[PDB]
């Protein structure tokens with residue numbers, strides 16, 4: 001019952017005294033859903049001195065089921081039967097995502113055990129994704145699995161996957177099926193993700209004083225409790241929105257934290273767990289830092305913050321995990337360390353002015369089983385590095401110039417592309433995406449409106465628009481790996497020109513899908529007056545090179561780029 005943790009400058013783990021094993025319903029407000037299957041421990045490398053590290057668990061629909069309002073009884077099916085929330089078969093197969101985070105600055109051993117005492121398999125049955133980074137894996141005599149994790153300034157963020165635990169997603173091209181159809185993905189029934197995080201840069205832990213910092217108290221977050229100081233600090237503990245906007249208690253998922261303008265910094269301590277969402281109002285540079293968790297698990301699908309947090313989609317008022325609707329100019333969001341869990345909608349949007357950028361690093365998103373759970377906006381000149389995002393919508397939204405995304409690992413469900421550049425005509429240059437590891441996908445359908453592809457551009461979102469020949473998109477995408485039977489490299493509906501668009505070092509080691517659903521096929525249709533200046537090199541599939549003689553639709557590359565673009569693009 002008492003956990004044995006360690007927290008020094010070498011490594012740091014933590015626990016919660018209100019962990020709850022629960023695979024079916026919401027956890028109690030002050031409890032934290034804990035893995036029903038795995039325990040994780042950490043020791044300095046080779047010292048056999050293991051310390052407990054809490055393993056969190058997230059489940060499709062968060063135990064709430066198909067409900068319209070956050071006050072509805074769990075699993076009461078009040079959501080309209082016609083609404084596809086992005087979840088179908090997943091609960092029946094027991095799909096869930098568990099994870100553990102610790103901090104480190106020296107080589108450690110990470111030990112995994114099954115909590116029922118059984119064997120997880122031998123080390124040869126263990127795969128760690130992304131496969132670009134290999135680990136030494138051994139078996140302890142109690143049947144555990146031990147992973148040597150070397151010190152790394154950028155940390156490590158990886159999925160540990162056991163052969164006998166893998167589920168095979170099958171699709172008939174319209175829905176997932178329990179047998180027959182075609183294989184569209186193979187991934188853990190019981191996912192286990194490890195975040196071996198570097199300690200925060202000194203500057204990203206704010207220096208706190210009584211007048212400087214509102215220190216929160218573990219328990220119900222009632223309205224106004226977050227105060228109006230420069231810093232909102234959640235020390236270790238569990239916190240939960242407990243009221244609606246009018247101040248009525250015992251209601252979960254019925255409000256969010258509308259910060260005062262004074263408050264420019266949210267700090268989540270390692271071992272803080274906050275059921276809520278953050279909307280900033282400041283006009284200075286603003287911050288979300290620290291190794292705690294912000295969870296949307298009490299919110300219903302599409303929870304509408306302008307309409308009592310019910311399940312009615314609004315592009316303007318459905319709840320973001322990180323939000324701003326009040327303008328400013330020359331602002332930068334610094335996001336270093338946080339994990340978000342179980343977002344009900346799009347995860348981040350800062351509105352009001354065009355003047356905004358972000359520095360995002362060591363930033364994680366888990367338990368995003370709902371549709372519309374896109375990654376954060378990639379505002380102009382943003383620098384993103386060392387991220388791990390589970391998504392069931394657009395992962396990397398390249399809508400703005402000058403941005404860099406580096407060392408991103410994406411775990412895709414079944415909706416929209418990895419990189420999204422469409423929905424409207426855009427002028428973009430000076431973007432680099434390097435070291436992109438797509439470790440899972442499980443597309444049900446082959447689609448272009450929501451592109452089932454690595455690099456995609458959706459057609460127009462609103463009607464009555466035309467493609468713009470005086471706009472162009474230019475970027476460099478390099479060192480990409482998609483693992484598993486993968487979707488197409490490109491599905492782009494051209495809404496403007498593409499020029500100097502470099503795609504280099506792209507590998508599909510397990511091959512593209514070649515089934516009758518057709519998801520493996522890249523599609524770039526004709527668009528009169530527009531160029532498709534794609535320069536592709538070092539594209540391999542299944543270990544074999546894609547060249548100018550096997551790129552085509554019915555060959556290896558499956559690249560159905562319209563003949564009208566001939567000469568504008570090259571594969572070498």
Ligand SMILES: OC[C@H]1O[C@H](OC[C@H]2O[C@@H](O)[C@H](O)[C@@H](O)[C@@H]2O)[C@H](O)[C@@H](O)[C@@H]1O
Nearest residue numbers: 084313371372393415416445447449450
């Ligand atoms: O974020 C994009 C989109 O995702 C969800 O819809 C996906 C469905 O789009 C339909 O047009 C298509 O016919 C289906 O096959 C797709 O599953 C979500 O429902 C929607 O609100 C979002 O805009």
